[PDB]
Design a protein around this nucleic acid. Structure first.
Lengths: 156, 205, 50
DNA sequence: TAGGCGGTAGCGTGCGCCAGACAGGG
DNA sequence: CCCTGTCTGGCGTCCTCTCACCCCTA
RNA sequence: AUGUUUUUUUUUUUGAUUUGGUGAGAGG
RNA sequence: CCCGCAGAAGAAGCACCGGCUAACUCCGGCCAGCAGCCCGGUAAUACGGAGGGUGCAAGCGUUAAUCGGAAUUACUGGGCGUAAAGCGCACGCAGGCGGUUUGUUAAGUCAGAUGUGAAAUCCCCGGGCUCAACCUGGGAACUGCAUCUGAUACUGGCAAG
């Protein structure tokens, strides 16, 4: 039921007395096609093991997101370290207008319709984190009604 | 302005059966439908994001037998129109005269239907229409003219259709060889495998 | 043979979740019926009851 | 590789009881 | 219509084990 | 006392529980 | 524009296939050559040829030029301890901004109306050329300017605190 996308894999080095020890980092993200989403960032000497780790980590520490039907509930900004991200709810049919790692996380999240730009850095890791942050902070109408002591129709 | 080459090759490349051949004989018998075309067929590495979108677009294109500028045209039209874009595009593609004919069952393949349209076989509301890209409109009756009514290939196409499932959005008569395009089809009525939203995204680059 | 005594479009698929055309072999993205042979990719237990 | 006595008729013949309807005789 | 004979339908133990056989002719 | 003074070799992935009947033999 | 005639007949190329970037193999020595950015020294998917593929298609490439991507002059929408970026420090005219209360005005502001904002173009619903492009009816828009009539919370002016 869960869908999982390996966003990126990158070779990283550690210099030692002999020479360079190489290793691989795997950035993955998983989601159930609904609110729930989680990213994982694994590392191992070989690629498949590292992606396996990324999947494992993503599977835990997931996070829920309040989706109005296929899209978002309102425009939302999210940042992390360099990657600053804007994403905006959009009409059915438009699809996921987003670039790169961001796209991936959106798809697994089960959002189908967004207009979305990544300002600043586009370092996959940071940008996916920023996306997750923007999705988490985003609140729903019912939530704001509760926050504020009102009905949904009062807020419209 | 048309693709004149091997058809099953396209099907193989796409992966699916595109219905580019009549359907008397199963596709698996005619070709290695699983294996991709060319020397390097058995090898099959995971495609890219752009690449999968591109393949989807190609699949649709190949299904209907249009060329790229014309599709881009269809897509822009759909975007202009109200409602879901990919759905609109699908409806537009369906509305094409030759496709309509193929759905009727006057052409074994869509290619055959296009050929019929070109050769002054088909009439729309009693007026001979020659353009395969002609967008047929609700309550438009579309028929074979009396000259082309004697052709054996037409009745063969009709038989093939009878084997094939009948579309709801149409109503065809096999004796009269005229069918009414009652309404523009719903997305549900069309095939589910087509990923319109990839196409949309592709051109929304 | 369609559509004699033993059928597929009257009574259902011979194999589990595998249509007669060959389109679908799934059960996760199920519910959708076939278009080629028009065999609803379901279970073969339904050939015991149709 | 493709179909239902085999024939210019006749094959059947060695269980037995009960029971209830259908009909014969008067 | 009131018997009285005929007819044709029902039924006739359980469990297990073994074996062959499962178109040829036009 | 001094060093930019011989520049050079390795990124990603295909499968786990299976099978019938009529008849002659034959144990209580 | 329509009808008749014959016969698949007269009608497919261009670019690319190292990554970005869809598409892979074989054969020919830092030469010959490629190249938009980041190969070639004898097993080159990067040069040239072939086969195979990919994308466009009566076009296909290259060059030039503009916007985009570039939030890379950031109104919307960036920054300045160390990455570029705080005047060496002050005073201070012009300029910019300006505590709090009441009254008044109505300049800014807002609302409504009138006049105009040529037609064409763009967009919406339609119509006509077999379709389309194209032509075309009506609308909307032309974010503005000017006036008149209101509103007075805020900003401004004036008067008192």
């Amino acid at each position: 039921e869960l869908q999982e996308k390996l966003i990126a894999v990158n070779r990283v080095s550690k210099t030692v007395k002999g020479g360079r020890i190489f290793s691989f980092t795997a950035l993955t993200v998983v989601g159930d096609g609904n609110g729930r989403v989680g990213f994982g960032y694994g590392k191992a000497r070989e690629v498949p093991a590292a992606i396996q780790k990324a999947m494992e980590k993503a599977r835990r520490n997931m996070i829920n997101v309040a989706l109005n039907n296929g899209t978002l509930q309102h425009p939302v900004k999210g940042v992390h370290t360099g990657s600053r991200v804007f994403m905006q709810p959009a009409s059915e049919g438009t699809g996921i207008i987003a670039g790169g790692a961001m796209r991936a996380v959106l798809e697994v999240a089960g959002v189908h319709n967004v207009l979305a730009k990544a300002y600043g850095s586009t370092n996959p890791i940071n940008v996916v984190r920023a996306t997750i942050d923007g999705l988490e902070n985003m609140n729903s109408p019912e939530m704001v009604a509760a926050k504020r002591g009102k009905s949904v129709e009062e807020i419209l | 302005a048309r693709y004149l080459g091997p058809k099953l090759k396209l099907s193989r490349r796409e992966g699916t059966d595109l219905f580019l051949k009549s359907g008397v004989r199963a596709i698996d018998t005619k070709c290695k439908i699983e294996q991709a075309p060319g020397q390097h067929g058995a090898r099959k590495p995971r495609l890219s994001d752009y690449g999968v979108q591109l393949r989807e677009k190609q699949k649709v294109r190949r299904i209907y037998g249009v060329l790229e500028r014309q599709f881009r045209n269809y897509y822009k039209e759909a975007a202009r129109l109200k409602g879901n874009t990919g759905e609109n595009l699908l409806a537009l593609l369906e509305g094409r005269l030759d496709n309509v004919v193929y759905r009727m069952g006057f052409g074994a393949t869509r290619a055959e239907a296009r050929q019929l349209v070109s050769h002054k076989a088909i009439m729309v509301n009693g007026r001979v229409v020659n353009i395969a890209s002609y967008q047929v409109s609700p309550n438009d009756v579309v028929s074979i003219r009396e000259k082309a009514k004697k052709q054996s290939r037409v009745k063969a196409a009709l038989e093939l259709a009878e084997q094939r499932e009948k579309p709801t959005w149409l109503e065809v008569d096999a004796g009269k060889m005229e069918g009414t395009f009652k309404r523009k089809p719903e997305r549900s009525d069309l095939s589910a495998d087509i990923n319109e939203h990839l196409i949309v995204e592709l051109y929304s680059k | 043979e369609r559509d004699g005594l033993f059928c597929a479009r009257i009574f259902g698929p011979v194999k589990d979740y595998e249509c007669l055309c060959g389109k679908y072999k799934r059960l996760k993205h199920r519910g959708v019926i076939c278009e080629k042979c028009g065999v609803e990719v379901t279970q073969t237990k339904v050939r015991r009851e149709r």
